[PDB]
Design a protein around this ligand. Structure first.
Ligand SMILES: NC(=O)c1ccc[n+]([C@@H]2O[C@H](COP(=O)([O-])OP(=O)(O)OC[C@H]3O[C@@H](n4cnc5c(N)ncnc54)[C@H](OP(=O)(O)O)[C@@H]3O)[C@@H](O)[C@H]2O)c1
Ligand SMILES: NC(=O)c1ccc[n+]([C@@H]2O[C@H](COP(=O)([O-])OP(=O)(O)OC[C@H]3O[C@@H](n4cnc5c(N)ncnc54)[C@H](OP(=O)(O)O)[C@@H]3O)[C@@H](O)[C@H]2O)c1
Ligand SMILES: COc1cc(NCc2ccc3[nH+]c(N)nc(N)c3c2C)cc(OC)c1OC
Ligand SMILES: COc1cc(NCc2ccc3[nH+]c(N)nc(N)c3c2C)cc(OC)c1OC
Lengths: 246, 246
């Protein structure tokens, strides 16, 4: 009942985007994470040390394919997010697909307690969205006037983000091809709200020991079954997986 | 730089053991764990809910190949370990390889605070080892007389297990082909002591949310690079990976 996986194909620059195609229509929330073999999401507090050239390449590709990159403010601070960068060819590909040259960043915050000073606001070609609650949306909008488009993403509860609503507000703005890059709290909520369509997971060929948190945190205990759409690899033993919710 | 992995081979019952062969000589500490896509080691407190027929098959195979199955007492209690079971054919294969019919269980405990009552002691064809410290080995041996062979596994510090010493004591008893099945504390120590030779990791196609711990816990922060030896899959989207320390 077991099948050996082997490299059967070198992916061309044209085929790789195809493997990570978004659906033709409808919203699609894709997550891109990286974790060690022993499930650690961080090395020395952040994820980058696990990411080699292969993962950076995939990471940048998923950004290139996304209409919008949604990230928790925690990751934004910790990973030092600034504006999404797109190279000339990336911009060309994006135009060819009917997309803006650079995907927007969307920072998720229940508190809305974002400072005007952040690099997500400062070092950015594209002004970012701030996805927050109905309760704080107005004060946040005022505080962040000129810096970010503040969008209330509450459903029934004005004090919380409803993640389905969040996805919908993005789509409503024509940002239906969503990529989230974390963090584990945000991902946890997406998973709990059952709005995660796809998880692209780089499995870095490291064990990192017990300190690191997982790529999902929170009190949530779910068991969402996913289908393995693909596994890619590179010469360094990384697995670039793509799982789609069943 | 990216290669697509695909199933290229259906593994026969003869080839599968070959993929998980131990080295011809020397000690080899292999770990077998299972984790969800989001790095969770447990569902509802234990690992079994993530394990389908494929993982059980691999799990049983690794047991069949091992001279000894080393587990923390935590896992022993929580997963309700009793004696290793071997079917007739499993025993035959084991004999053919020069191995005893059933691998021993080795329970690791720094405290040595094991009760005579446990199923590891009671429902077992083979009496298990208790790998513990020099400091408690004697009282533990007395307490567990007739139930378990108690082995002191301290190196410099009589109050602790030295995991290299643990591996050595096993080999010393002709149990050089070691399988550890956990838990995360034990695995954490193996990883910290740098004695983990190989990690066989089932990646179950689930996200489980933030509650679960990882397959490694502890204060440890390492970055042990591993080489991806193989990835198998089944029809249900599980990845059966084998990584070998570089
Ligand atoms: N290995 C990987 O792939 C990966 C990927 C990303 C991040 N990381 C790492 O994980 C760490 C950060 O963890 P984190 O959990 O704090 O990241 P995070 O989820 O990005 O940040 C948490 C914050 O974002 C907001 N948030 C998240 N979900 C929300 C929701 N459903 N509704 C409203 N607000 C929401 C909240 O902000 P407010 O407090 O303002 O309400 C929350 O406090 C960093 O160390 C980073 O390196 C790893
Ligand atoms: N997903 C998976 O593949 C997988 C695999 C195994 C277990 N699990 C799960 O993980 C959980 C158990 O976690 P756990 O960390 O408590 O398991 P554990 O490592 O098996 O148990 C911990 C105990 O074993 C002893 N121990 C471990 N390492 C030691 C060392 N280097 N030296 C001396 N003693 C050592 C200690 O016993 P003393 O206190 O007596 O000193 C320690 O308290 C369960 O929920 C189980 O389901 C999951
Ligand atoms: C400044 O913005 C950036 C932030 C980060 N943060 C760390 C980082 C690294 C690898 C990653 N790899 C995957 N698979 N998924 C992630 N979620 C991820 C993250 C979160 C990494 C960047 O380069 C890869 C980057 O530049 C665009
Ligand atoms: C009674 O002993 C047993 C204990 C367990 N415990 C849970 C369990 C399940 C799947 C697993 N799968 C892998 N890849 N690695 C593990 N470490 C593992 C464990 C730890 C599972 C058993 O059946 C699979 C079993 O019977 C032999």
């Amino acid at each position: 009942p077991l099948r050996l996986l082997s490299s059967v194909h070198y992916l061309t620059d044209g085929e790789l985007p195809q493997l990570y195609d978004y659906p033709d229509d409808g919203t699609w929330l894709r997550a891109n994470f990286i974790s060690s073999l022993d499930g650690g999401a961080t090395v020395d507090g952040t994820s980058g040390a696990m990411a080699g050239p292969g993962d950076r390449f995939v990471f940048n590709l998923l950004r290139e394919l996304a209409d919008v990159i949604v990230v928790g403010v925690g990751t934004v601070r910790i990973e030092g997010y600034s504006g999404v960068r797109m190279g000339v060819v990336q911009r060309q590909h994006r135009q060819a697909r009917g997309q803006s040259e650079v995907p927007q960043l969307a920072i998720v915050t229940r508190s809305g307690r974002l400072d005007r000073d952040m690099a997500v606001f400062t070092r950015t070609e594209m002004a970012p969205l701030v996805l927050t609650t109905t309760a704080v949306a107005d004060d946040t909008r005022q505080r962040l006037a000129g810096l970010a488009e503040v969008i209330a993403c509450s459903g029934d509860d004005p004090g919380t983000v409803d993640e389905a609503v969040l996805v919908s507000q993005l789509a409503a703005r024509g940002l239906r091809r969503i990529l989230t890059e974390g963090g584990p709290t945000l991902l946890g909520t997406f998973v709990e709200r059952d709005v995660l369509d796809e998880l692209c997971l780089t499995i870095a060929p490291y064990v990192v020991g017990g300190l690191a948190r997982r790529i999902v945190t929170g009190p949530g205990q779910v068991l969402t079954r996913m289908r393995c759409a693909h596994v890619l690899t590179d010469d360094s033993g990384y697995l670039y997986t793509r799982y789609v919710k069943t």
